[PDB]
Amino acid sequence: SEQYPVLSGAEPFYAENGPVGVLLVHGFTGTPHSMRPLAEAYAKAGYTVCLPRLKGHGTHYEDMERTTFHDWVASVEEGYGWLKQRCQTIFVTGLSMGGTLTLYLAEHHPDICGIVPINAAVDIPAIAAGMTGGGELPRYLDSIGSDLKNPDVKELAYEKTPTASLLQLARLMAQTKAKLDRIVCPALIFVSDEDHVVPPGNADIIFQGISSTEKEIVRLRNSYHVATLDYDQPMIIERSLEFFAKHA
Ligand SMILES: *[P@](=O)(CCCN=[N+]=[N-])OCCCCCCCCCCCCCC
């Protein structure tokens, strides 16, 4: 029900190739742009890929305000279902809330062959901190600045963040965190040492909470939050390809 046009570079991306699929999920207020280089690299290597645009994302923040986390889940379920028609083995990877949605999916779908969450969020104390300051909360908050080490990169993201959406995110994370123990599939967890948006300790929470026997944390020493576009991008791609091949 978006009323604004999809921004250039924020379109969903599909590639139909082999019988192994990768679903790529972008983050909160973010767009497919943050995940596109990964998507193209995986498609080139012969994977069928689906990079959806989350409902209310990549248009305008007014559109986002109307959406709930169930809408964002539905956008990822559509992508999953699209892969399931073309693929017998499926991996899911995501940045930030895209990582949260990756964990969410694996909690609901045991058939998922492996997950690659990247700076995934299950606990962001800054949200409660902003809600408890005593002041009237604006309907729309000025968004946190783009967090990248590479100075020449610009994340495509909303300049304002609806308060309603932030509350929706907090609810999504709370449920996702609570059910981490349902995940048993292999997990490759990337975390930026210097993430100024999602506390790096989230990676430890996820690592300890999931029940997976095959799990690993890989630390990114040359990236901030938006690692998929940052200096460690080629290593993320290389390590993920290794992970997919090992489990495909
Ligand atoms: P990821 O999904 C990447 C999106 C880029 N960051 N943003 N936004 O991050 C998920 C969590 C969103 C950032 C959490 C910080 C929000 C803190 C604001 C709380 C309200 C304070 C205003 C008074």
PDB file of C-alpha atoms and ligand atoms in Angstrom:
ATOM      1  CA  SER A   1       0.000   0.000   0.000  1.00  0.00           C
ATOM      2  CA  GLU A   2       3.036   2.267  -0.478  1.00  0.00           C
ATOM      3  CA  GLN A   3       2.073   5.662  -1.929  1.00  0.00           C
ATOM      4  CA  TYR A   4       5.608   6.739  -2.810  1.00  0.00           C
ATOM      5  CA  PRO A   5       7.746   5.396  -5.665  1.00  0.00           C
ATOM      6  CA  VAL A   6      10.477   2.847  -5.004  1.00  0.00           C
ATOM      7  CA  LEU A   7      13.829   4.673  -4.956  1.00  0.00           C
ATOM      8  CA  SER A   8      16.366   3.891  -7.695  1.00  0.00           C
ATOM      9  CA  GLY A   9      18.477   0.999  -6.436  1.00  0.00           C
ATOM     10  CA  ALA A  10      15.812  -0.083  -3.942  1.00  0.00           C
ATOM     11  CA  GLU A  11      14.027  -2.555  -6.259  1.00  0.00           C
ATOM     12  CA  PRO A  12      13.670  -6.227  -5.302  1.00  0.00           C
ATOM     13  CA  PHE A  13      16.196  -8.456  -7.106  1.00  0.00           C
ATOM     14  CA  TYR A  14      15.665 -12.000  -8.398  1.00  0.00           C
ATOM     15  CA  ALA A  15      17.943 -14.448 -10.226  1.00  0.00           C
ATOM     16  CA  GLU A  16      16.856 -17.930 -11.256  1.00  0.00           C
ATOM     17  CA  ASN A  17      19.803 -20.336 -11.547  1.00  0.00           C
ATOM     18  CA  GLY A  18      20.652 -23.610  -9.842  1.00  0.00           C
ATOM     19  CA  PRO A  19      18.703 -25.770  -7.328  1.00  0.00           C
ATOM     20  CA  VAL A  20      20.390 -24.099  -4.323  1.00  0.00           C
ATOM     21  CA  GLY A  21      18.845 -20.805  -3.218  1.00  0.00           C
ATOM     22  CA  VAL A  22      19.897 -17.774  -1.183  1.00  0.00           C
ATOM     23  CA  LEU A  23      17.412 -15.389   0.395  1.00  0.00           C
ATOM     24  CA  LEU A  24      18.949 -12.021   1.282  1.00  0.00           C
ATOM     25  CA  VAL A  25      17.220  -9.671   3.744  1.00  0.00           C
ATOM     26  CA  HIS A  26      17.984  -5.965   4.182  1.00  0.00           C
ATOM     27  CA  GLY A  27      17.577  -3.923   7.357  1.00  0.00           C
ATOM     28  CA  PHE A  28      15.203  -1.586   9.198  1.00  0.00           C
ATOM     29  CA  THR A  29      14.639   1.678   7.229  1.00  0.00           C
ATOM     30  CA  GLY A  30      17.114   0.194   4.728  1.00  0.00           C
ATOM     31  CA  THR A  31      16.702  -1.137   1.163  1.00  0.00           C
ATOM     32  CA  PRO A  32      17.825  -3.975  -1.137  1.00  0.00           C
ATOM     33  CA  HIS A  33      20.802  -1.714  -2.017  1.00  0.00           C
ATOM     34  CA  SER A  34      22.726  -2.860   1.088  1.00  0.00           C
ATOM     35  CA  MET A  35      22.504  -6.511  -0.010  1.00  0.00           C
ATOM     36  CA  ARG A  36      22.701  -6.199  -3.802  1.00  0.00           C
ATOM     37  CA  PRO A  37      26.472  -6.843  -4.177  1.00  0.00           C
ATOM     38  CA  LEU A  38      26.133 -10.064  -2.157  1.00  0.00           C
ATOM     39  CA  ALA A  39      23.095 -11.098  -4.228  1.00  0.00           C
ATOM     40  CA  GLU A  40      24.949 -10.573  -7.497  1.00  0.00           C
ATOM     41  CA  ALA A  41      28.028 -12.405  -6.296  1.00  0.00           C
ATOM     42  CA  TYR A  42      25.926 -15.413  -5.243  1.00  0.00           C
ATOM     43  CA  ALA A  43      23.929 -15.429  -8.478  1.00  0.00           C
ATOM     44  CA  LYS A  44      27.183 -15.354 -10.489  1.00  0.00           C
ATOM     45  CA  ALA A  45      28.337 -18.437  -8.558  1.00  0.00           C
ATOM     46  CA  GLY A  46      25.204 -20.310  -9.677  1.00  0.00           C
ATOM     47  CA  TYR A  47      22.807 -19.791  -6.792  1.00  0.00           C
ATOM     48  CA  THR A  48      19.207 -18.865  -7.320  1.00  0.00           C
ATOM     49  CA  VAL A  49      18.776 -15.648  -5.303  1.00  0.00           C
ATOM     50  CA  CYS A  50      15.891 -13.583  -3.982  1.00  0.00           C
ATOM     51  CA  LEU A  51      16.428 -10.114  -2.475  1.00  0.00           C
ATOM     52  CA  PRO A  52      13.032  -8.741  -1.577  1.00  0.00           C
ATOM     53  CA  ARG A  53      12.070  -5.188  -0.739  1.00  0.00           C
ATOM     54  CA  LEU A  54      10.495  -5.193   2.730  1.00  0.00           C
ATOM     55  CA  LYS A  55       7.039  -3.672   2.797  1.00  0.00           C
ATOM     56  CA  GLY A  56       7.143   0.062   3.540  1.00  0.00           C
ATOM     57  CA  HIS A  57      10.875   0.188   2.720  1.00  0.00           C
ATOM     58  CA  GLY A  58      12.702   1.928  -0.126  1.00  0.00           C
ATOM     59  CA  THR A  59       9.870   4.386  -0.754  1.00  0.00           C
ATOM     60  CA  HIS A  60       9.239   6.967   2.005  1.00  0.00           C
ATOM     61  CA  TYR A  61       9.167   6.828   5.782  1.00  0.00           C
ATOM     62  CA  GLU A  62       5.448   7.731   5.771  1.00  0.00           C
ATOM     63  CA  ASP A  63       4.800   4.387   4.047  1.00  0.00           C
ATOM     64  CA  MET A  64       6.908   2.587   6.628  1.00  0.00           C
ATOM     65  CA  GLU A  65       4.881   3.961   9.551  1.00  0.00           C
ATOM     66  CA  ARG A  66       1.841   1.957   8.403  1.00  0.00           C
ATOM     67  CA  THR A  67       3.646  -1.393   8.481  1.00  0.00           C
ATOM     68  CA  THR A  68       4.082  -3.902  11.302  1.00  0.00           C
ATOM     69  CA  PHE A  69       6.801  -6.515  11.713  1.00  0.00           C
ATOM     70  CA  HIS A  70       4.267  -9.040  10.377  1.00  0.00           C
ATOM     71  CA  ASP A  71       4.403  -7.132   7.100  1.00  0.00           C
ATOM     72  CA  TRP A  72       8.220  -7.345   7.012  1.00  0.00           C
ATOM     73  CA  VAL A  73       7.961 -11.062   7.822  1.00  0.00           C
ATOM     74  CA  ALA A  74       5.432 -11.508   4.993  1.00  0.00           C
ATOM     75  CA  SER A  75       7.876  -9.886   2.542  1.00  0.00           C
ATOM     76  CA  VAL A  76      10.530 -12.433   3.532  1.00  0.00           C
ATOM     77  CA  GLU A  77       8.064 -15.343   3.503  1.00  0.00           C
ATOM     78  CA  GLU A  78       7.154 -14.357  -0.092  1.00  0.00           C
ATOM     79  CA  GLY A  79      10.840 -14.493  -0.970  1.00  0.00           C
ATOM     80  CA  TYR A  80      11.299 -17.847   0.768  1.00  0.00           C
ATOM     81  CA  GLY A  81       8.263 -19.284  -1.015  1.00  0.00           C
ATOM     82  CA  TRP A  82       9.604 -17.962  -4.334  1.00  0.00           C
ATOM     83  CA  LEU A  83      12.873 -19.839  -3.763  1.00  0.00           C
ATOM     84  CA  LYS A  84      11.046 -22.983  -2.572  1.00  0.00           C
ATOM     85  CA  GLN A  85       9.463 -23.233  -6.043  1.00  0.00           C
ATOM     86  CA  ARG A  86      12.871 -23.287  -7.734  1.00  0.00           C
ATOM     87  CA  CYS A  87      15.189 -24.739  -5.093  1.00  0.00           C
ATOM     88  CA  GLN A  88      15.432 -27.826  -2.904  1.00  0.00           C
ATOM     89  CA  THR A  89      18.116 -26.330  -0.656  1.00  0.00           C
ATOM     90  CA  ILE A  90      17.822 -22.799   0.788  1.00  0.00           C
ATOM     91  CA  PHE A  91      20.135 -20.505   2.773  1.00  0.00           C
ATOM     92  CA  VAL A  92      19.129 -17.207   4.346  1.00  0.00           C
ATOM     93  CA  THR A  93      21.401 -14.240   5.019  1.00  0.00           C
ATOM     94  CA  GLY A  94      20.571 -10.750   6.297  1.00  0.00           C
ATOM     95  CA  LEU A  95      22.016  -7.475   7.585  1.00  0.00           C
ATOM     96  CA  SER A  96      20.856  -5.952  10.910  1.00  0.00           C
ATOM     97  CA  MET A  97      17.071  -6.411  11.142  1.00  0.00           C
ATOM     98  CA  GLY A  98      17.611  -8.493   8.010  1.00  0.00           C
ATOM     99  CA  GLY A  99      19.679 -10.664  10.317  1.00  0.00           C
ATOM    100  CA  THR A 100      16.804 -10.621  12.837  1.00  0.00           C
ATOM    101  CA  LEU A 101      14.429 -11.784  10.089  1.00  0.00           C
ATOM    102  CA  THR A 102      16.963 -14.461   9.128  1.00  0.00           C
ATOM    103  CA  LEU A 103      16.853 -15.821  12.690  1.00  0.00           C
ATOM    104  CA  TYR A 104      13.055 -15.420  12.699  1.00  0.00           C
ATOM    105  CA  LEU A 105      12.689 -17.564   9.554  1.00  0.00           C
ATOM    106  CA  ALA A 106      15.037 -20.290  10.844  1.00  0.00           C
ATOM    107  CA  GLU A 107      12.943 -20.394  14.032  1.00  0.00           C
ATOM    108  CA  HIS A 108       9.877 -21.206  11.915  1.00  0.00           C
ATOM    109  CA  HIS A 109      11.429 -23.337   9.145  1.00  0.00           C
ATOM    110  CA  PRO A 110      13.658 -26.353  10.025  1.00  0.00           C
ATOM    111  CA  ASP A 111      14.111 -27.052   6.284  1.00  0.00           C
ATOM    112  CA  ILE A 112      16.446 -24.037   6.000  1.00  0.00           C
ATOM    113  CA  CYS A 113      19.916 -25.467   5.304  1.00  0.00           C
ATOM    114  CA  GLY A 114      21.941 -22.709   6.979  1.00  0.00           C
ATOM    115  CA  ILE A 115      21.935 -19.076   8.079  1.00  0.00           C
ATOM    116  CA  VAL A 116      24.390 -16.187   7.699  1.00  0.00           C
ATOM    117  CA  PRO A 117      23.260 -13.315   9.918  1.00  0.00           C
ATOM    118  CA  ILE A 118      25.367 -10.139   9.677  1.00  0.00           C
ATOM    119  CA  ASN A 119      25.309  -7.665  12.581  1.00  0.00           C
ATOM    120  CA  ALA A 120      21.936  -9.172  13.486  1.00  0.00           C
ATOM    121  CA  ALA A 121      19.916  -7.397  16.152  1.00  0.00           C
ATOM    122  CA  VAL A 122      18.185  -9.141  19.066  1.00  0.00           C
ATOM    123  CA  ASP A 123      18.872  -6.511  21.750  1.00  0.00           C
ATOM    124  CA  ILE A 124      19.146  -2.743  21.166  1.00  0.00           C
ATOM    125  CA  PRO A 125      19.129  -0.942  24.580  1.00  0.00           C
ATOM    126  CA  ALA A 126      19.181   2.429  22.766  1.00  0.00           C
ATOM    127  CA  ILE A 127      15.497   1.887  21.919  1.00  0.00           C
ATOM    128  CA  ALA A 128      14.441   1.636  25.588  1.00  0.00           C
ATOM    129  CA  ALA A 129      16.842   4.475  26.435  1.00  0.00           C
ATOM    130  CA  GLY A 130      14.985   6.768  24.012  1.00  0.00           C
ATOM    131  CA  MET A 131      11.561   5.650  25.292  1.00  0.00           C
ATOM    132  CA  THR A 132      12.409   6.312  28.968  1.00  0.00           C
ATOM    133  CA  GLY A 133      13.951   9.785  28.710  1.00  0.00           C
ATOM    134  CA  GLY A 134      10.799  11.431  30.061  1.00  0.00           C
ATOM    135  CA  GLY A 135      10.202  13.625  27.043  1.00  0.00           C
ATOM    136  CA  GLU A 136       7.379  13.584  24.548  1.00  0.00           C
ATOM    137  CA  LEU A 137       8.387  11.293  21.706  1.00  0.00           C
ATOM    138  CA  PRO A 138       8.069  12.800  18.213  1.00  0.00           C
ATOM    139  CA  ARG A 139       6.005  10.825  15.716  1.00  0.00           C
ATOM    140  CA  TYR A 140       9.079  10.723  13.471  1.00  0.00           C
ATOM    141  CA  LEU A 141      12.636  10.604  14.813  1.00  0.00           C
ATOM    142  CA  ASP A 142      15.738  11.778  12.978  1.00  0.00           C
ATOM    143  CA  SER A 143      17.412   8.550  11.878  1.00  0.00           C
ATOM    144  CA  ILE A 144      20.798   7.449  13.158  1.00  0.00           C
ATOM    145  CA  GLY A 145      23.598   8.392  10.762  1.00  0.00           C
ATOM    146  CA  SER A 146      24.936   5.881   8.246  1.00  0.00           C
ATOM    147  CA  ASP A 147      27.582   3.762   9.991  1.00  0.00           C
ATOM    148  CA  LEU A 148      30.323   2.791   7.512  1.00  0.00           C
ATOM    149  CA  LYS A 149      34.111   2.759   7.736  1.00  0.00           C
ATOM    150  CA  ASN A 150      34.552   3.348   3.991  1.00  0.00           C
ATOM    151  CA  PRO A 151      33.921   7.133   3.793  1.00  0.00           C
ATOM    152  CA  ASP A 152      32.899   7.013   0.109  1.00  0.00           C
ATOM    153  CA  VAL A 153      29.878   4.762   0.673  1.00  0.00           C
ATOM    154  CA  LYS A 154      26.321   5.973   1.277  1.00  0.00           C
ATOM    155  CA  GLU A 155      23.678   3.627   2.630  1.00  0.00           C
ATOM    156  CA  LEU A 156      20.274   4.182   1.084  1.00  0.00           C
ATOM    157  CA  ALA A 157      18.033   4.627   4.143  1.00  0.00           C
ATOM    158  CA  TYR A 158      15.242   6.863   5.451  1.00  0.00           C
ATOM    159  CA  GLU A 159      16.309  10.184   7.016  1.00  0.00           C
ATOM    160  CA  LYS A 160      13.450   9.819   9.508  1.00  0.00           C
ATOM    161  CA  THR A 161      12.381   6.771  11.531  1.00  0.00           C
ATOM    162  CA  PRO A 162       8.745   6.434  12.588  1.00  0.00           C
ATOM    163  CA  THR A 163       8.293   5.892  16.330  1.00  0.00           C
ATOM    164  CA  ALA A 164       5.621   3.293  15.573  1.00  0.00           C
ATOM    165  CA  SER A 165       8.090   1.289  13.451  1.00  0.00           C
ATOM    166  CA  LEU A 166      10.744   1.359  16.167  1.00  0.00           C
ATOM    167  CA  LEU A 167       8.250  -0.137  18.602  1.00  0.00           C
ATOM    168  CA  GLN A 168       7.443  -2.777  15.977  1.00  0.00           C
ATOM    169  CA  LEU A 169      11.138  -3.606  15.643  1.00  0.00           C
ATOM    170  CA  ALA A 170      11.546  -3.934  19.421  1.00  0.00           C
ATOM    171  CA  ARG A 171       8.649  -6.408  19.436  1.00  0.00           C
ATOM    172  CA  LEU A 172      10.113  -8.402  16.560  1.00  0.00           C
ATOM    173  CA  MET A 173      13.493  -8.616  18.305  1.00  0.00           C
ATOM    174  CA  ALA A 174      11.954  -9.659  21.618  1.00  0.00           C
ATOM    175  CA  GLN A 175      10.125 -12.599  20.037  1.00  0.00           C
ATOM    176  CA  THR A 176      13.122 -13.558  17.875  1.00  0.00           C
ATOM    177  CA  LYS A 177      15.460 -13.539  20.878  1.00  0.00           C
ATOM    178  CA  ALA A 178      13.036 -15.581  22.977  1.00  0.00           C
ATOM    179  CA  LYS A 179      12.892 -18.447  20.466  1.00  0.00           C
ATOM    180  CA  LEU A 180      16.579 -18.647  19.449  1.00  0.00           C
ATOM    181  CA  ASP A 181      16.800 -22.189  20.862  1.00  0.00           C
ATOM    182  CA  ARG A 182      14.545 -23.460  18.056  1.00  0.00           C
ATOM    183  CA  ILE A 183      17.318 -22.845  15.517  1.00  0.00           C
ATOM    184  CA  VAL A 184      19.412 -25.977  14.865  1.00  0.00           C
ATOM    185  CA  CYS A 185      20.716 -25.367  11.328  1.00  0.00           C
ATOM    186  CA  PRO A 186      24.377 -24.426  10.658  1.00  0.00           C
ATOM    187  CA  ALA A 187      25.079 -20.747  11.368  1.00  0.00           C
ATOM    188  CA  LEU A 188      27.837 -18.394  10.239  1.00  0.00           C
ATOM    189  CA  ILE A 189      27.534 -15.215  12.321  1.00  0.00           C
ATOM    190  CA  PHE A 190      29.339 -12.063  11.155  1.00  0.00           C
ATOM    191  CA  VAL A 191      29.900  -9.189  13.574  1.00  0.00           C
ATOM    192  CA  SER A 192      31.665  -5.853  13.114  1.00  0.00           C
ATOM    193  CA  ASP A 193      34.049  -5.161  16.016  1.00  0.00           C
ATOM    194  CA  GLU A 194      33.159  -1.501  15.729  1.00  0.00           C
ATOM    195  CA  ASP A 195      29.417  -1.576  15.109  1.00  0.00           C
ATOM    196  CA  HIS A 196      28.001   1.721  16.384  1.00  0.00           C
ATOM    197  CA  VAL A 197      24.361   0.779  15.674  1.00  0.00           C
ATOM    198  CA  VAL A 198      23.855  -2.810  16.819  1.00  0.00           C
ATOM    199  CA  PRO A 199      25.932  -3.696  19.927  1.00  0.00           C
ATOM    200  CA  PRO A 200      28.489  -6.378  18.931  1.00  0.00           C
ATOM    201  CA  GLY A 201      27.446  -8.447  21.957  1.00  0.00           C
ATOM    202  CA  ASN A 202      24.330  -9.389  19.972  1.00  0.00           C
ATOM    203  CA  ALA A 203      26.509 -11.911  18.120  1.00  0.00           C
ATOM    204  CA  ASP A 204      27.293 -13.611  21.439  1.00  0.00           C
ATOM    205  CA  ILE A 205      23.634 -13.635  22.451  1.00  0.00           C
ATOM    206  CA  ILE A 206      22.733 -15.317  19.157  1.00  0.00           C
ATOM    207  CA  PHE A 207      25.681 -17.747  19.266  1.00  0.00           C
ATOM    208  CA  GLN A 208      24.786 -18.904  22.790  1.00  0.00           C
ATOM    209  CA  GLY A 209      21.017 -18.902  22.310  1.00  0.00           C
ATOM    210  CA  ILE A 210      20.711 -21.053  19.205  1.00  0.00           C
ATOM    211  CA  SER A 211      20.862 -24.853  19.507  1.00  0.00           C
ATOM    212  CA  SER A 212      22.897 -25.375  16.315  1.00  0.00           C
ATOM    213  CA  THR A 213      25.832 -27.805  16.629  1.00  0.00           C
ATOM    214  CA  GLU A 214      27.662 -26.126  13.744  1.00  0.00           C
ATOM    215  CA  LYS A 215      28.048 -22.423  14.580  1.00  0.00           C
ATOM    216  CA  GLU A 216      30.848 -19.873  14.220  1.00  0.00           C
ATOM    217  CA  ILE A 217      31.303 -16.141  14.778  1.00  0.00           C
ATOM    218  CA  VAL A 218      33.484 -14.287  12.261  1.00  0.00           C
ATOM    219  CA  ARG A 219      34.671 -10.860  13.417  1.00  0.00           C
ATOM    220  CA  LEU A 220      34.949  -7.987  10.936  1.00  0.00           C
ATOM    221  CA  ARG A 221      37.928  -5.801  11.820  1.00  0.00           C
ATOM    222  CA  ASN A 222      37.592  -3.231   9.024  1.00  0.00           C
ATOM    223  CA  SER A 223      33.859  -2.468   8.940  1.00  0.00           C
ATOM    224  CA  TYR A 224      31.195  -0.685  10.953  1.00  0.00           C
ATOM    225  CA  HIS A 225      27.489  -1.567  10.934  1.00  0.00           C
ATOM    226  CA  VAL A 226      26.770  -1.709   7.180  1.00  0.00           C
ATOM    227  CA  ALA A 227      29.429  -4.358   6.635  1.00  0.00           C
ATOM    228  CA  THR A 228      27.889  -5.630   3.395  1.00  0.00           C
ATOM    229  CA  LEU A 229      28.972  -2.367   1.711  1.00  0.00           C
ATOM    230  CA  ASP A 230      32.097  -1.845   3.842  1.00  0.00           C
ATOM    231  CA  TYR A 231      35.757  -2.843   3.549  1.00  0.00           C
ATOM    232  CA  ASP A 232      35.095  -6.435   4.622  1.00  0.00           C
ATOM    233  CA  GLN A 233      32.578  -7.043   1.834  1.00  0.00           C
ATOM    234  CA  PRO A 234      34.803  -9.374  -0.225  1.00  0.00           C
ATOM    235  CA  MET A 235      35.587 -11.500   2.810  1.00  0.00           C
ATOM    236  CA  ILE A 236      31.871 -11.736   3.715  1.00  0.00           C
ATOM    237  CA  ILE A 237      31.162 -12.956   0.170  1.00  0.00           C
ATOM    238  CA  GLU A 238      34.099 -15.384   0.134  1.00  0.00           C
ATOM    239  CA  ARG A 239      33.284 -16.900   3.534  1.00  0.00           C
ATOM    240  CA  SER A 240      29.569 -17.166   2.723  1.00  0.00           C
ATOM    241  CA  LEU A 241      30.300 -18.952  -0.578  1.00  0.00           C
ATOM    242  CA  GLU A 242      32.475 -21.403   1.371  1.00  0.00           C
ATOM    243  CA  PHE A 243      29.619 -21.921   3.832  1.00  0.00           C
ATOM    244  CA  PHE A 244      27.015 -22.509   1.106  1.00  0.00           C
ATOM    245  CA  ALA A 245      29.246 -24.960  -0.777  1.00  0.00           C
ATOM    246  CA  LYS A 246      30.061 -26.892   2.392  1.00  0.00           C
ATOM    247  CA  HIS A 247      26.372 -27.420   3.197  1.00  0.00           C
ATOM    248  CA  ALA A 248      24.887 -27.670  -0.325  1.00  0.00           C
TER     249      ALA A 248
HETATM  250  P1  LIG B   1      19.622  -2.480  11.242  1.00  0.00           P
HETATM  251  O1  LIG B   1      18.286  -2.967  10.835  1.00  0.00           O
HETATM  252  C1  LIG B   1      20.253  -1.334   9.993  1.00  0.00           C
HETATM  253  C2  LIG B   1      19.338  -0.111   9.912  1.00  0.00           C
HETATM  254  C3  LIG B   1      20.162   1.160  10.123  1.00  0.00           C
HETATM  255  N1  LIG B   1      19.934   1.673  11.481  1.00  0.00           N
HETATM  256  N2  LIG B   1      18.918   2.108  11.666  1.00  0.00           N
HETATM  257  N3  LIG B   1      17.958   2.583  11.991  1.00  0.00           N
HETATM  258  O2  LIG B   1      19.510  -1.722  12.658  1.00  0.00           O
HETATM  259  C4  LIG B   1      18.405  -2.251  13.396  1.00  0.00           C
HETATM  260  C5  LIG B   1      18.161  -1.391  14.637  1.00  0.00           C
HETATM  261  C6  LIG B   1      17.852   0.046  14.211  1.00  0.00           C
HETATM  262  C7  LIG B   1      18.821   1.005  14.903  1.00  0.00           C
HETATM  263  C8  LIG B   1      18.522   1.039  16.403  1.00  0.00           C
HETATM  264  C9  LIG B   1      18.810   2.439  16.950  1.00  0.00           C
HETATM  265  C10 LIG B   1      17.490   3.153  17.245  1.00  0.00           C
HETATM  266  C11 LIG B   1      17.645   4.013  18.501  1.00  0.00           C
HETATM  267  C12 LIG B   1      16.543   5.074  18.532  1.00  0.00           C
HETATM  268  C13 LIG B   1      15.584   4.779  19.688  1.00  0.00           C
HETATM  269  C14 LIG B   1      14.727   6.015  19.968  1.00  0.00           C
HETATM  270  C15 LIG B   1      15.621   7.157  20.455  1.00  0.00           C
HETATM  271  C16 LIG B   1      15.016   8.497  20.030  1.00  0.00           C
HETATM  272  C17 LIG B   1      14.821   9.384  21.263  1.00  0.00           C
END
